[PDB]
């Protein structure tokens, strides 16, 4: 049901990407259906964000070799410190990496988790409630761009609840 929902309600390209991010590292998407669903959602957000500008480099959804190649190439030509972990985007207009959070919980809680896990990386957090949080409250995008994202997340939430899948999903976050 959760799997059916994922395959039915997300772009093939994204489902194909989500499944590799799992299947290389040994997780089965037929069993960790909620993680599957989550990874897809996070990918979709990253792509959506990436599209609404060529302002943004998409670093998520690549294999490790490509991502670090892309990160190194950005660091050689801009001078910006190289982060320890792969973030999700780079913003060529503000000249900072971005880490994208999607949370079923409250935004400040997921913000702190991420902020603690890392330093000059801009953090942006979306919830399924149309709530967002971002370092220095600098939300990077225009409101229209941030509304498409919020709608889309909320839509996913509402589709999940149609199929009685939201409650499971909500509770399987850290
Ligand atoms: O596409 C990725 O690179 C990716 N995204 C995620 C990811 C992103 C957002 C949420 C979650 C998640 N939700 N619930 N459990 N994990 C997982 C995890 C990975 O291990 C991963 O390799
Ligand atoms: O691999 C990543 O790039 C990645 N991984 C994660 C990730 C990895 C493991 C667990 C979780 C998680 N558990 N609950 N919520 N998120 C999230 C989140 C991201 O936003 C992200 O960009
Ligand atoms: Mn990432
Ligand atoms: Mn992220």
Q: What ligand 1 atom has the least distance to the C-alpha of 101? A: 9
Give the distance (Å) from ligand 2 centre to CA of residue 103: 10
Whole-angstrom CA distances from 22 to 13, 33, 102 are 15, 11, 18
Q: Give the DSSP letter of residue 67.
A: H
Residue spans per domain, the chain: 1-174
Burial class (CB in 10 A: 0-12, 13-18, 19+), 1: exposed
Residue 60 labelled as part of a binding site: yes
- Alpha helices in the chain, H assignment, sequence order: 2-9, 12-23, 33-51, 64-76, 107-117, 143-162, 166-171
Choose, from 82, 114, 120, 150, the residue flagged as catalytic. 114
Residue 88 labelled as part of a binding site: yes
Give the distance (Å) from ligand 1 centre to CA of residue 163: 23
Ligand nearest to the CA of 38: 1
Rounded to an integer, what distance in angstroms lies between the CA atom of residue 76 and that of residue 23? 32
Distant-in-sequence, close-in-space partners of 109: CB < 8 Å, separation ≥ 6 = 103
Q: What is the CATH number of domain 1-174?
A: 3.40.91.90
Nearest to 96 by CA among 71, 64, 125: 71
Give the distance (Å) from ligand 1 centre to CA of residue 42: 7
Rounded to an integer, what distance in angstroms lies between the CA atom of residue 16 and that of residue 103? 22
Ligand nearest to the CA of 58: 3
Residue 64 Cα to chain centre, angstroms: 16
Tell me whether residue 117 is one of the annotated catalytic residues: no
Residues with CB under 6 A from ligand 1: 21, 35, 38-39, 42, 60-61, 102, 173
Rounded to an integer, what distance in angstroms lies between the CA atom of residue 97 and that of residue 83? 8
Give the number of other Cβ atoms within 10 Å of residue 40's Cβ: 24
Rounded to an integer, what distance in angstroms lies between the CA atom of residue 128 and that of residue 106? 10
Rounded to an integer, what distance in angstroms lies between the CA atom of residue 67 and that of residue 69? 5
Rounded to an integer, what distance in angstroms lies between the CA atom of residue 75 and that of residue 72? 5
């Amino acid at each position: 049901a959760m799997e059916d929902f994922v395959r039915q309600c997300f772009n093939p390209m994204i489902v194909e990407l989500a499944e590799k991010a799992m299947k290389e590292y040994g997780e089965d998407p037929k069993i960790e259906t909620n993680k599957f669903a989550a990874i897809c959602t996070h990918l979709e957000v990253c792509f959506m964000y990436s599209d609404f500008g060529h302002r943004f480099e998409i670093i998520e959804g690549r294999d490790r070799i490509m991502a670090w190649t892309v990160v190194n190439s950005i660091c050689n030509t801009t001078g910006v410190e190289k982060p320890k972990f792969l973030p999700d985007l780079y913003d060529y207009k503000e000249n900072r990496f971005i880490e994208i959070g999607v949370t079923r919980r409250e935004v400040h809680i997921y913000y702190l988790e991420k902020a603690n896990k890392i330093e000059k990386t801009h953090i942006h957090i979306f919830s399924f409630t149309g709530e967002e949080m971002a370092t220095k409250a600098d939300y990077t995008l225009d409101e229209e761009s941030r509304a498409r994202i919020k709608t889309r997340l909320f839509t996913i939430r509402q589709e999940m609840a149609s199929r009685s899948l939201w409650d499971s999903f909500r509770q399987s976050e850290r």
